[PDB]
Swiss-Prot record, chains A, B:
Record-given protein name: Cysteine desulfurase SufS
GO biological process assignments: cysteine metabolic process
Its EC number(s): 2.8.1.7
Class in the EC hierarchy, top level: transferase
Organism the protein comes from: Bacillus subtilis (strain 168)
Subunit structure: Homodimer. Interacts with SufU; this interaction induces an opening of the active site pocket of SufS. Interacts with frataxin/Fra.
A Pfam family reported for this protein in Swiss-Prot or TrEMBL: Aminotran_5
Catalytic residues identified in the record: 361
Length: 405, 405
């Protein structure tokens, strides 16, 4: 895994901001794309764009085979049993909303519980808040350990025989924690619940195998995994999808339309109403080919190296707090003592360095951490230890600067 | 308006299928894209991709300004009063589903009516079927005249003081009919109803002015108007949007998130949950710039010429039935006597010619027309009368061929 040769495929990395080479450390907000993905969109719009699932004409057939081809690539990439379990959506947020609308709203009654955790991103909070309000069910929170991990005994405590849904992130976009999904799925199933996994921050960075995890539903976003914006996937076990009603209705997802009543297509097309995200989903198949060629285990080993290096170099700085555990995904969320994280991010952008400052769509977690906001540097397959040196040198200079001020 | 110079900007037109120059006459299913749009996606992913609505770092600010910039371009393009009324979605189908979920489901009771027409595309049928079933309201159909137009007296008859919603296409994707939306909106408002306009087939081809039409909601798709797939718009009057609840929930559309309760952003962001369709919406702004540079009135005058030429040349063929009125948008849906439309479309594809055969997502209309399927040739700004000659010559040869057979 050669990082020079990988970075050479990402045109956007090769430019300056404010007179300094770009140092992009915000891949947890969105990732950058290699030429293989951008040229796959180009070749689609230059050569074979047409609407799909007619195949009466030649370009139509080629677009269809591209779109359903990419469905198979995603099936293989997360080790789903069938393409019937792979639904294309606009992103993780829409995928989790589909489960909350079609599954939760149809299966919750007063007495029932939905259990989540305090570290969840809002995409995996607000749909559940709404589904429990609609049904008169109850929402509960799994507590966190002091290093921001989840203990399985706390899971066992919170989940009861009235739990119907446990929803949890695979990897936290703030703490970097990798949650014990596979053991949490056992706990859910033992209680008679399903588990819904927010895989937006795990899928880009480590191999996913939904048969090993045994999750009931798993959601992911193309834009965080070197693929186009506007597209994601919802995986669900086929027997659950078969019994769920569609979240949206229209052409493409019907079989017969009468004046008042209609019947639905089989899966997966039951859940894909209207002309699909044709180019984006073919580009997400290209991103999967690109990542698979490098090797997800190789990219996870590179991120492990960068995260171990970052945590060590952050410990060298005085007056800097890092949140979450030592074992983690490739990101560090932090604050400088007495400097607002927004001013940290502004000063770093003057040195070329892109990081995020704010709540990271995790307000309940910020409250748990007893802070109003934090800064976050995140890493991906194109980042290097030299860029981490530049970040830690800039935080040192920021510290000195606001000191002099 | 020079058609040679326009076609030179669409790389996909310049290729052969089955040994014959491509003749693409299926723009009512999806349109082709000019280099200005494809190179706008390229320049986004090559130079300034980042997540939006943080602007703490330089690329982030540029992506944000691109995305909200394109929102303003769409506002101006349909003459909306405010960007608060312009919501980005994945397509017309999702936009109409949002109205059916957030508006209809909250405003229908037993006794209330939703009125549609028999010519509607399924996207503007099935959401209403579902919303009336959920609420115990009634669905009614405006009847059609024999040439497939709508009379305003039939509108006045069908719409009553119990109507709450009239939903209708601006232009029919089968009949080519242009509906009298502006006068239908008056009839709706006089009865106390809102009007929801499916503008998927009008927006690419003629100027839209939502203040002149006075529609309450208007939906459109990027992929039919030279823009990227996976993106559309829902326009709604600000006072209606303000009182509707979100259709989906997550990051980006919240202001404050507590453990059990959350409050929403102002419009338009209240209706855009999760990381948005950043590249696609910037490419749809580029498509609007491209179309505005040519001039929508110029493209409508070209389509009028092509449709008048086609209807005349189709009348020259024996044994060919054309459906719908003489005055129409740029498409012809037809059948050859005694030839199945699927076999017509197959034979034409062997001569390079791409058309559609089937129900065109309008099963109730096919039933009204007393046919099980039809063939459709549709036209756009890059098509020419010579291509229409090739279609009519091919139908003549198809007629002779199945005759000999």
């Amino acid at each position: 895994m050669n990082i020079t040769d990988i970075r050479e495929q990402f045109p956007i990395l090769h430019q300056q901001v404010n007179g300094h080479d770009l140092v992009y450390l915000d891949s947890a907000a969105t990732s950058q794309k290699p030429r293989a993905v951008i040229e796959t969109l180009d070749k689609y719009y230059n050569q074979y764009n047409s609407n799909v699932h007619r195949g009466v004409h030649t370009l139509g057939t080629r677009a269809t085979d591209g779109y359903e081809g990419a469905r198979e690539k995603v099936r293989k990439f997360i080790n789903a049993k069938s393409m019937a379990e792979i639904i294309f959506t606009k992103g993780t947020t829409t995928s989790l909303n589909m489960v909350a609308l079609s599954y939760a709203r149809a299966n919750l009654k007063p007495g029932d519980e939905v259990v989540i955790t305090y570290m969840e991103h809002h995409a995996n909070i607000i749909p559940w808040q709404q589904a429990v309000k609609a049904t008169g069910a109850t929402l509960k929170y799994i507590p966190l350990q002091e290093d921001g991990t989840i203990s399985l005994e706390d899971v066992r405590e919170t989940v009861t025989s009235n739990t119907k849904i446990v929803a949890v992130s695979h990897v936290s976009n703030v703490l970097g924690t990798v949650n014990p999904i596979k053991e949490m799925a056992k706990i859910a199933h033992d209680n008679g619940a399903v588990i819904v996994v927010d895989g937006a921050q795990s899928t880009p960075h480590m191999k996913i195998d939904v048969q090993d995890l045994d999750c009931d539903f798993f959601a992911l976003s193309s834009h965080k995994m070197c693929g186009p914006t506007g597209v994601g996937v919802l995986y669900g076990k086929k027997a659950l999808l078969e019994n769920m009603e569609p979240a949206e209705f229209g052409g493409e997802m019907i079989d017969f339309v009468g004046l008042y009543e209609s019947t639905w297509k089989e899966l997966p097309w039951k859940f894909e109403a209207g002309t699909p995200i044709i180019a984006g989903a073919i580009g997400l198949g290209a991103a999967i080919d690109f990542l698979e060629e490098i090797g997800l285990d190789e990219i996870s080993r590179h991120e492990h190296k960068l995260a171990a290096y970052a945590l060590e170099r952050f410990r060298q700085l005085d007056g800097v707090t890092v949140y979450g555990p030592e074992e983690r995904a490739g990101l560090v969320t932090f604050n400088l003592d007495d400097v607002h994280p927004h001013d940290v991010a502004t000063v770093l952008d003057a040195e070329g360095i892109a990081v995020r400052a704010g709540h990271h769509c995790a307000q309940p977690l910020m409250k748990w951490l007893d802070v109003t906001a934090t800064a976050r540097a995140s890493f991906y397959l194109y980042n290097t230890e030299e860029e981490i040196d530049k970040l830690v040198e800039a935080l040192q200079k920021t510290k000195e600067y606001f000191t002099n001020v």
